[PDB]
Amino acid sequence: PFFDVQKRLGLDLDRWMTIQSAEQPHKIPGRCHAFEKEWIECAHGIGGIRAEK
């Protein structure tokens, strides 16, 4: 199934385009940058089930 080649080699093939708060050109912010940043920091390292609950 999922073979995490990027995480194994540290390549960053497509992770730059996944979220709004990830290094936009010319530091242009997303409309909901703060909310998504807060949600991501809340759910980091916790797991999907606990993150959802």
Binding site: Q20, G30, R31, C32
Partner: peptide
């Protein structure tokens, strides 16, 4: 365009 997500204009 609505959400100003710059990098998905590609």
């Amino acid at each position: 365009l609505n959400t100003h997500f710059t990098l998905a204009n590609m």
